[PDB]
Write a protein that binds this ligand. Structure first.
Ligand SMILES: C[As](C)(=O)[O-]
Ligand SMILES: C[As](C)(=O)[O-]
Ligand SMILES: [Fe+2]
Ligand SMILES: [Fe+2]
Ligand SMILES: [Fe+2]
Ligand SMILES: [Fe+2]
Lengths: 299, 299
């Protein structure tokens, strides 16, 4: 029947396609006859899949002009060293803090190691360019990106999930590329699972600000596809509520004397399955523990 | 450590005691030197336990003057035929709709059958008086009950859980006896599980009205004890949110083609354990299915 989520590779709207894996998608925006943008930077191992899809839509790779990046996590920038060399005219648009992480050998080693863990036996990665050789340009909170005549996207700072996270708001289409700032959309239940890995105060304040946008028609997180209808319209509000709900559960359990590890293991059991293809199980469990440490400290 | 729930038989406050089983408690209010009230009507099988506790606090059973009843469900009035004969001066205070159910042989047979299922092998029920012989007086929405010099309780209609449900608000102590109108308090997670068995529109409207009470200090549902602190202060708001959350889950699952039975069985698995001592498992599962039918119809 009719559903409030579009989650299949191919055309999502007359200007928008989903490339690659719906679990870690790259979005393609048609900005004009011979101009395109990518949104979200994916995982390295998807390089040839995303390339194959891209070339179905884009006749000449020199026509890809922008690549918008929400945050520095390994699953949101892993394609950059592999596909940017094939995109001679692309400019990577990322926050200043995101750009800074790509200059840190420590940070990029973590990104590389996690991406390497996801390589399947059959596939061959193309040659990687250096992370500090990427064609990057820093974007600022509030900045207007005039990508094409019918694509004006505002950069909105949305820290909390991570210290660098931004979202991109298409004012014309009432479409928000929200990365991981709302959490992980639960494919079985239709609710947001919080992903607070840096700062709960910031995460909630970001959601407060995003709630004040004009009512959304389309909401596109970092994983799982495109949400529409009420799922888009109430996404930020719902994500805020789910974060407060997790805080309530944690506080109640702590009042009974539970260690953080009990709820962490429960969340890992309940939620880890959705991301097994792109997130090692032990890192998922560790992430749940970190989130609960943050909520406990700040709630 | 300090917890926001009191859940042990005995004194809860200087005017208030919990009698019987914390799972299906009867509350004792000291209205004066020689005047007392009971709140909530429990399950029949607890008659001698509640009697034993009552007589620890009350020197003379003729001093019990009122018995406040939230609703007609079998687990909220089962003690009445067994203990009212031992309470010569008691007046049972119930809504008109609640009183009407006790006049219906069909309705009381259901109450009797469910209560009989809960009798343990060891115990002996005292002789029951007829349901239409109970010393009942109907109370109205908005009615002020002047129970004693320091106990003024307002009757507030709170339909939705059932067609007859009311709650009792102690204006002085900012204490709400809320029956099942907020749902079932989850002992492991500290959130409300919705219990919508008649009408979702009414259930939500009741919670909207209860949210507008002065901030609560104490919130006393039909099961599980007394809540305080933020759990009391945000109870009605939280219960409203949890009902909307369940609607979201159901609607999402229905959009995927699920039958009501799938979520019903999941809820029965997740939630049925808490009430096994006083609610037959098949009735819990049936109740979950009924709730989901109502939410589907009205959401
Ligand atoms: C790697 As993640 C849980 O921030 O999408
Ligand atoms: C018997 As019931 C689930 O309304 O407390
Ligand atoms: Fe992330
Ligand atoms: Fe992510
Ligand atoms: Fe009930
Ligand atoms: Fe009940």
């Amino acid at each position: 029947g009719s559903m409030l989520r579009l989650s299949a590779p191919g055309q999502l709207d007359d200007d928008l396609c989903l490339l690659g894996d719906v679990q870690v998608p790259v979005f393609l925006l048609r900005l004009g006859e011979a101009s395109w943008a990518l949104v979200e930077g994916g995982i390295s191992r998807d390089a040839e899949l995303v390339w194959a899809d891209l070339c179905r839509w884009v006749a000449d790779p020199s026509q890809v002009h922008y690549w918008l990046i929400t945050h520095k996590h390994y699953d949101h920038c892993g394609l950059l060293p592999y596909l940017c060399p094939r995109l001679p005219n692309v400019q990577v648009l990322a926050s200043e803090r995101t750009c800074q992480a790509w200059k840190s050998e420590s940070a990029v080693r973590v990104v590389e190691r996690l991406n390497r863990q996801l390589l399947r036996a059959e596939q061959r990665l193309p040659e990687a360019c250096a992370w500090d050789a990427l064609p990057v340009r820093a974007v600022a909170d509030g900045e207007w990106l005039e990508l094409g005549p019918r694509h004006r996207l505002q950069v909105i700072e949305a820290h909390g999930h991570s210290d660098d996270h931004v979202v991109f708001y298409d004012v014309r289409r009432r479409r928000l590329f929200c990365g991981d700032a709302l959490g992980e959309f639960d494919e079985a239940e239709g609710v947001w699972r919080p992903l607070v890995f840096d700062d709960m105060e910031a995460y909630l304040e970001s959601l407060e600000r995003l709630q004040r946008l004009p009512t959304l028609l389309q909401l596109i997180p970092g994983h799982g596809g495109l949400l529409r209808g009420r799922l888009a319209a109430d996404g930020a509000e719902s994500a805020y509520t789910e974060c407060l709900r997790l805080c309530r559960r944690l506080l109640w359990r702590q009042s009974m004397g539970e260690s953080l590890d009990e709820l962490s293991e429960e969340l890992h059991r309940a939620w880890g399955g959705q991301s097994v293809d792109f997130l090692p199980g032990e890192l998922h469990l560790g992430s749940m523990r970190r989130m609960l440490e943050i909520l406990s400290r700040q709630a």
